[PDB]
């Protein structure tokens, strides 16, 4: 039945034509699921922090009899919590301490240890801990490190079709990229020449790398080429014949198979003769002599008597050699096949181009080629070649490369070494040659099986390993020099490089960026994005075009909808709602198991490759009562191409209809009724939904809005939900029941709300409570509602009554007409808490003290300041006024009489300081919420900090008091329960506890003992609380750690408030965007017989050109919901009976097909029905799935239910003339979302400001006063007009010329309106820059 | 790079700025700069008035 | 590069300088001590390399910085490339009088006006207001005028209105391919923070009213104002400089209004009667006649220019409708009556304005254009066109056509499995069959979305043109086309998205019903390809324009 | 610093009409070279033209 009593207030009418089997996951366990293994203690050193130590920590000195052993590590407790780290401005990290061991061995004795120093733990830097949901705290901010998509390490075979020489050929190449080390490639030439290009170097020669591995010429010839048979005795030339290999088009002559000739000379080839020759036993048959000239020798042969160098390897045989190989005695000279069809001579064709033939002369050529400046000395030629990609310390693949290597070569074993071997390259080249010949298929680049996502879990590990391998060198160099000496373990292990690397990775990187706090959806979308940019993958952003495209394997692993429309389109992707990371790093997707025609409730997570082997059905297929199919031929996918199959060949089936949809694109109603472009742009604009004052519920509904809101990590939940006792605007206490609590605790939980706290985009983060007083709350229920939330669900915008009609050309193309009743009703009003801050910057001449009595300033302007010089919180600071007075101590002079006289005249002003306070930026206004102040510990100041100090302390004082308060009662209660029938009265003990009157003859036995026992406990508690808060005080007044010069800062938080205006840009979920055009009064708006004028007017010209029937359906559903809500409101206002209301609600809920059941009067106690009806009296919310929403018939039925025209259109009147429109116009309440780009945040103009020192040009960006670049596209427009004079006045006079702009200003102020060209400064700068070289240039006459 | 060293005013250029706007003749403008350039930034002028007459060269 | 104060962090331009300086100093100091030949040779080689890298660090230099591996800025890279001195000395420098405000719409303006916010003013025409206050005596000095402007009193707004009375201004948009991207306008003060814009000139700037940032430049000198008034003024360039055709032609809303106000019916309210001609407007605001009343006789005065361009009047009592009769008053005298007695689509008013500019002149053409825009906005507001779920209807024979097509595909695949048809032949035959089915569905859609509105009469059936909003906004030419409407009722088609490969089974759904997940997923590839192509073609077009302009 | 980059005695002075020395710090002396430090007191604008 129904549950979640908190959600049971406003029940959403979901349709759900398809049932649900798999519950929606946490939807935000990717960053935290991968970062957890980085700190969790693993039983074996496989992954995480153990894999960073067990890998390269046990380093050994250079024969110094020293060893470094690792026992275990531990992470200390953080100094501050998540709250204080963002307030103060310090990072949130935990200290790392590890116990090491220094094993020293005595010389001249094997395995002889004298002592060990494994009794001290060393601290190696602080690792940045992770917050409750995926986020991190760095320098008071909140950053996110997006996971990066990388091709899995392994062997890849590219094609490069029609891009070699424009001749129509292809060069099948091969590449092998490891996880850490150097690369290796095998390129192919149109002239059948192989390359050994390494690390994108020059084109290397033929396969000499195999010759450098002790493999001689004959070994490679026997390996890559096979010798079938050869025999010659007394000029017989008899050889065995194989039908599969020795074939071709025709035969020259002399073809007899044991007597009777099967294939005559000069006859066509027949398969029947080949079959008859293969069936019958055929021995070695005679062959002509002309075939000897064509075939090439395989191995090296020499004469028996003479041992000269005749008959070398890789040399075609000739007739002149025949005699000289006939008398030598070589009867068996093995040869090659040399078949252009299958077994090509490509290997032999490249061996003849090798400059060297011996391994020694071969291994020295690659050394001078990889390194430009290096002489062959027989010293590094072997070591560098062995340490390049054959050493463990310089080459590794983390077993992922090994798995992909074993999988691409049809190997069964999955375990191997990180380094490469000879047989590995042998098999790689063999498969490459086979693919070139036509054995095998070309691998796919953009296939997801080859791609994998890397989160912080396997990136912070790499960063820590890189930071530790640097200190490893210092440890090695220190253990060698001065080893025989007793020292501390922390002798040379300084965690400077490790800390620097961790800081460079987390703080400022290419993947670590500020999160989008515009809305709860923005952050949950940004945490689930996937990018291909960063330190790896492709080369740059201008990489290719076929990579940034959708693939058939992108069905249920990424989102093809959510993607930007900028220069990085396609590269950015979004994870699906059911996507999940694999153990190796791949992407998996769930599917139900379908056996013997029935569907089993069990699910399996298939990967990208495994999905290609089975047959996967669709979620939109009908299902019988017994799990059977209605239609025999169901649409299913087999190998990418979907088609109809029988009910017996189906293997798997999808889970839901939103499996191909992400977390943000699933919040679009009627997605299938929208174009792929409009839905895309609507989901993109949905990320930037700016919140408002009161979030309005999405009456239309799209699905798991409650789930998205509760998983976005923006609201507060109630863990161990019991009973609520005290509610407040910033504090909520909850008394947990006896069942859901453990002993040793008071049994209360406290939640401190977050009220008006800044975000990464100056968006206020406010929270609101939900329970009033003494309401039972279950576990996991939402207690507090944050920004853009309403009763636990997500609400990005507001419901608004729209009407698609032209209105005096104000909605001409895409402008949205807005009534005046929308500004009056405080709708779409946003708060903006921007906050600047003035430093101290203590000099060396004096300490500029922030005072409250500066010079050159009236008393009226200093009437807003404090006694210590700091703007009172609550003041309505506007324009440009003093915010934080601060005078810099200027170096005072000496005697100079005038000063002496002047000084006496006034005092403490003349020759004292140089006024320079904060001053609110020219263009900022609004009340100042609160001011924070950080001071360097040890400085005798704390003027206004004391006030703040008390406040903070006070809050904590009561915070831990309540818990203790309750404890006290129990103690007395126990004493009062122990004093029962012990000669004690009621009022006597009530008047004053006093430890039960010091056990005044309660029982004269255990009574006193109990009392004593209780006394101790009571006293213990007192001391406990004392020290409990004792530490708290210390931390609060522990001081702040700033920089060097800075003395004491004081950040002030301003707080504006904007209503809407004709320059604001709003949009919807469907993609229909636009700016306002006019704010017309209420009366001008259209209306009808009843009234209620529309608030928003839209343009219907977009619907035909842009397929957005989804918004029409949304409008109709909103109209029906509002009609039902108005009927309910009327029934509540007429004070009707509860039975009629309950019947009406049940009838409005139970309408539709057998898709969902919901009935009242079975769980509600006649009191929750009125509560439910009060929450939706302004309209009840609906819910329609992504690809399983309501149908037109159901919408028309819901419209007819609400006592209104079934069509949806209605005859509207005119609010200006007063007549009626002949054509009916569609009305309803749709959902609108406010955007971030406004007009009061970008509009700026100027005429004269400050210009740069270079070429004397103004600024371009939004500085105090900046201009706009006048590009070439603008002057090209002017040259075709005749604006030569305008161009002349815009190029020099008002841009570059220094005296020119001043003279122009003078002439305009005087009223002359003339121009003097002169000469710009940019040309002079150019001449000065050209004269800096050996080039002469000067102006002549 | 960063050769955008924004410039400023402060009673030397600002003082000179006003000079142009007002109607001062060639002989007067010339003289104006002499006295507007002897104005110490701290507060008042440096040299005496008679100095200024001698540094006109008349 | 003045930093916080701790380290200056110079612009890495004097670093090469100090390197060369100290290298030459140590070389000259070593030369005086008679060093060995090898040492002095290596030192002079290092000096040569340092001097060669100082001029340019892009030839065997590979210079790095102290912070990261960034190339050191030489004296040759700051004079070339995209960012450099030759792109800061040419038209690449920022200019004052910026603008930068969101563009909105305005139906009360004319062809040579623009809504300028009062807040954007008082900062642009600042030296002008200063001079005005100085001449009016209300400003004794310059500091006084500056103080009065800073306080923003009542008098400075009147002074600004007086100054900006007849001072031309010019507008510019960031993407400006053709010369029409920069025009001039007469600024008009409007309360607000957004810049209004004429609906007809919008097509000139190629905007869609999703307002981006704009630019507003102010001519200071007299000759610049003269050039902006005589050459850059919008009332001077009406035709396109590429083909000599008018571009100020009305847009969707005006087209829709003019098409709705010009439409004949069968049995209207009070048809048949004879009208004077200027009386049709009276019965429009009352109930004695409909705008769509056909078979109505009303005389009109047609002026011709036969005798040496002299206006000769002629009356013939032509039969027309109430709407066309009312529109005729807007039509000037120098035009015949056979230009408005029609359907009046998009091309109709275009060629009407073309003929008007050809015959009657520029000023009367501009007058006719603004009046046409006014009356089109008015009739489009009075009409009340809306799009609903009932405004589109799926053909009833569509399911039968789909069943026949799938039966034909089944027969084709059966013949293929029998061994008579190969793979490629069967594939092409299935493609052709699906194309024929799509064509037949598209043809049957027009049977219901066109001339399918029967009205009761003496014959009970007349089969006049339909009055569906989807069809009236399409056929007129306002917005959309028949191919886009086809996807609304019929089938989308084959949609060969992946690498152009056609799929055997095409999408048989429409944007009104509920599409399948797989069909939407397949269709998504085409949009991803299209968006990428549109994002990529812009750079190529810009490079082509740059090269062509630089060459010619 | 003396005889270096941005130094005195070349590239114009660091101020309007005064050398780094500290004499002739006014318009009274315009085209004379100070004996203490040989820095011209011509103008500050001349620094970008030397």
Coordinates of C-alpha atoms in Angstrom, one line a residue, chain A residues 973-1117:
Chain A
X973 CA 14.2 10.2 37.7
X974 CA 16.4 7.2 38.5
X975 CA 17.1 8.7 42.0
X976 CA 13.4 9.5 42.4
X977 CA 12.6 5.9 41.3
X978 CA 15.2 4.6 43.7
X979 CA 13.8 6.8 46.5
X980 CA 10.4 5.2 46.2
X981 CA 9.2 4.0 49.6
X982 CA 12.3 5.2 51.3
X983 CA 10.9 7.7 53.8
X984 CA 10.5 10.4 51.2
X985 CA 7.5 12.7 50.4
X986 CA 6.3 14.1 47.2
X987 CA 6.7 17.9 47.6
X988 CA 9.8 17.5 49.8
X989 CA 11.7 15.9 46.9
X990 CA 9.9 18.2 44.4
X991 CA 10.8 21.4 46.2
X992 CA 14.5 20.6 45.9
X993 CA 16.3 17.4 44.6
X994 CA 19.6 17.8 46.6
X995 CA 20.6 14.2 45.8
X996 CA 17.5 12.8 47.4
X997 CA 18.3 14.5 50.7
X998 CA 21.8 12.8 51.0
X999 CA 20.2 9.4 51.3
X1000 CA 18.3 10.3 54.4
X1001 CA 17.6 6.8 55.7
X1002 CA 16.2 5.5 52.5
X1003 CA 17.0 1.9 53.3
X1004 CA 20.3 2.0 55.1
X1005 CA 21.9 -0.6 52.8
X1006 CA 21.8 -0.4 49.0
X1007 CA 19.9 2.9 49.2
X1008 CA 23.0 4.9 50.2
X1009 CA 25.1 2.8 47.8
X1010 CA 22.6 3.6 44.9
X1011 CA 22.6 7.2 46.0
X1012 CA 26.4 7.2 46.1
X1013 CA 26.5 5.5 42.7
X1014 CA 24.0 8.0 41.3
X1015 CA 25.9 10.9 42.9
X1016 CA 29.1 9.8 41.1
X1017 CA 27.2 9.5 37.8
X1018 CA 25.5 12.9 38.3
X1019 CA 28.9 14.5 39.2
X1020 CA 30.5 12.7 36.3
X1021 CA 27.9 14.1 33.9
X1022 CA 28.6 17.6 35.1
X1023 CA 32.3 17.2 34.5
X1024 CA 31.6 15.5 31.2
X1025 CA 29.5 18.4 29.8
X1026 CA 32.0 20.9 31.2
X1027 CA 34.9 19.5 29.2
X1028 CA 32.6 18.7 26.3
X1029 CA 32.0 22.4 25.7
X1030 CA 35.5 23.2 27.0
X1031 CA 37.0 22.0 23.8
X1032 CA 34.3 23.7 21.7
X1033 CA 35.3 27.1 23.1
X1034 CA 39.0 26.5 22.2
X1035 CA 38.2 25.6 18.6
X1036 CA 35.9 28.6 18.1
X1037 CA 38.5 31.0 19.4
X1038 CA 41.4 29.1 18.0
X1039 CA 42.4 31.9 15.5
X1040 CA 42.6 32.0 11.8
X1041 CA 45.6 31.3 9.5
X1042 CA 45.9 33.8 6.7
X1043 CA 48.8 34.7 4.4
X1044 CA 52.0 36.7 5.1
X1045 CA 51.3 40.4 4.6
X1046 CA 47.6 40.2 5.4
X1047 CA 46.9 41.2 9.0
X1048 CA 43.1 40.9 9.4
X1049 CA 40.4 40.7 6.7
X1050 CA 36.7 41.5 6.9
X1051 CA 34.3 40.1 4.2
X1052 CA 31.0 41.8 4.0
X1053 CA 27.9 40.1 2.5
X1054 CA 25.5 42.3 0.5
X1055 CA 22.0 41.1 -0.5
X1056 CA 20.0 42.4 -3.4
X1057 CA 16.6 41.4 -4.8
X1058 CA 15.4 41.6 -8.4
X1059 CA 11.9 41.4 -9.8
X1060 CA 11.4 40.6 -13.5
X1061 CA 11.8 43.2 -16.3
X1062 CA 11.3 43.4 -20.1
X1063 CA 15.0 42.4 -20.4
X1064 CA 14.8 39.1 -18.6
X1065 CA 15.1 35.7 -20.5
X1066 CA 12.8 32.9 -19.4
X1067 CA 12.3 29.4 -21.0
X1068 CA 10.5 26.1 -20.4
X1069 CA 11.3 22.4 -20.2
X1070 CA 10.4 21.9 -23.9
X1071 CA 12.9 24.4 -25.3
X1072 CA 10.7 27.3 -26.0
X1073 CA 12.8 30.3 -24.8
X1074 CA 12.7 34.0 -25.4
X1075 CA 12.9 37.4 -23.6
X1076 CA 10.1 39.7 -22.4
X1077 CA 8.9 42.5 -24.6
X1078 CA 6.5 44.5 -22.5
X1079 CA 4.9 44.5 -19.0
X1080 CA 1.3 45.4 -19.9
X1081 CA -1.4 46.0 -17.2
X1082 CA -3.9 43.4 -16.1
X1083 CA -6.8 45.0 -18.0
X1084 CA -5.1 44.7 -21.4
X1085 CA -4.8 40.9 -20.9
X1086 CA -7.5 38.7 -22.5
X1087 CA -10.1 37.0 -20.4
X1088 CA -13.5 35.2 -20.7
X1089 CA -17.0 35.2 -19.2
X1090 CA -15.8 34.1 -15.8
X1091 CA -12.6 36.1 -15.7
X1092 CA -9.1 35.3 -14.4
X1093 CA -6.9 37.0 -17.1
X1094 CA -3.9 35.1 -18.5
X1095 CA -0.6 36.0 -17.1
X1096 CA 1.7 34.9 -19.9
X1097 CA 1.2 35.1 -23.7
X1098 CA 3.2 33.0 -26.1
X1099 CA 3.6 32.9 -29.9
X1100 CA 2.1 29.8 -31.7
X1101 CA 4.2 30.2 -34.9
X1102 CA 6.9 28.1 -33.3
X1103 CA 4.8 24.9 -33.0
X1104 CA 4.6 24.2 -36.8
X1105 CA 8.2 24.9 -37.5
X1106 CA 9.4 23.4 -34.3
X1107 CA 7.7 20.1 -33.3
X1108 CA 6.7 20.9 -29.8
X1109 CA 3.3 19.1 -29.3
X1110 CA 4.7 18.2 -25.9
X1111 CA 4.1 21.7 -24.6
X1112 CA 0.5 21.7 -25.9
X1113 CA -0.1 18.4 -24.1
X1114 CA 1.6 19.9 -20.9
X1115 CA -0.8 22.9 -21.2
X1116 CA -3.8 20.7 -21.5
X1117 CA -2.8 18.5 -18.6

